Amino acid sequence: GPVIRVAGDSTAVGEGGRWMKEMVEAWGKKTGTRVEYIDSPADTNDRLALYQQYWAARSPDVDVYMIDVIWPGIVAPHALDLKPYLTEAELKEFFPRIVQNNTIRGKLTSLPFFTDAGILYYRKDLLEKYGYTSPPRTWNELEQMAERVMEGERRAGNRDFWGFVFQGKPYEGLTCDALEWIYSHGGGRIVEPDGTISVNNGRAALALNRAHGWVGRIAPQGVTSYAEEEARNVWQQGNSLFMRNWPYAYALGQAEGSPIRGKFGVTVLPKASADAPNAATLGGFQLMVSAYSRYPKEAVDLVKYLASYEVQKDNAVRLSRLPTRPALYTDRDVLARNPWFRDLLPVFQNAVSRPSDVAGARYNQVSEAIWTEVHSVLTGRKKGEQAVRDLEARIRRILRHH
Ligand SMILES: OC[C@H]1O[C@H](O[C@H]2O[C@H](CO)[C@@H](O)[C@H](O)[C@H]2O)[C@H](O)[C@@H](O)[C@@H]1O
């Protein structure tokens, strides 16, 4: 009978690809359907290019794709409309914000799978060691704590120790980190939901300058090459006081044999001052049936299974990834394993989105502009003032007649 083929997640990022393949095989065994898993590169923007090869070809060789929250507006022509396959009651079990994000010109492109928000990981043993009782609330405090703990850990002999790691590589992850920096300085959303390109302002410029000031000082010089896993591996070996990353890193850090197990917490990222808004960039993935799938019925069944309560629960318990069903955030087993899901739920709900709705099918070009201009500041090629002006001009060209 049919072979249902799935491309989504990567075995290069934590346990996501291995776990996704396991869930697909479980569905296959449950329903007596043959399945195949096709691996993907680590970085979301590389995945988009890979999947676009299949879509350009109208290829029937993948039935189900795991698609980034930033993609519906780009990928909608390649998605089977799921709306007729779900009842209104079924759809209401997901956060309405994500269902709305996934709906493009009335087409439900994809089912919400897991959400995501940028958070601050911090070594609580080290905060205590150095006389701090709370994680930092402001970027200035983060800097002061990092300098002090670094001075001490280096003096004690850990020459590998850094104050802060984050995603500074030129790719989509840096758009995520940079939106957090800019927004948390009161510098706006880069492109506002109304279309206004707002990034050329002194608060956004300050945010980028500040981040440059970390590189080679509290963060490794090589941070300008780090994606999620490069940052996580410095952190997880016990060599960083702080890390900006997504929820998945938590379960990995708690695993048996992790050097940092039991030694860290998570909190909202810092901000410039008490009246700036908190910033956590909205992430996460959705489940799309290919418009080119020869087996829509079976592929829809698989996507419903993957998005189900018990598969999302398993994702939360084992991989510390955030459900897209509000009912899971009150589940006793989810909460006992991840108590921070409760503490940060409002951070997750107030996550700031990248400008994917407003940029639509042009979002990838906009983000490339953002990450290359931000990167030119991290590398020291440009100051923030010049980079936000140059970025404004680039985005104006991209979106001109959008
Ligand atoms: O659970 C974390 C996931 O990390 C990646 O996805 C996040 O980071 C991307 C940027 O690098 C965002 O565009 C995305 O929205 C985030 O969810 C990774 O691509 C995933 O497969 C991981 O599960």
From TrEMBL:
It holds the Pfam family SBP_bac_1. Transmembrane segments: none annotated. Keywords: Signal, Transport. It comes from the Bacteria. InterPro entries: Bact_solute-bd_prot1, SBP. The keyword Signal applies. PANTHER family: ABC TRANSPORTER PERIPLASMIC-BINDING PROTEIN YCJN-RELATED, ARABINOSE-BINDING PROTEIN-RELATED. Belongs to the bacterial solute-binding protein 1 family. This is ABC transporter, periplasmic substrate-binding protein.
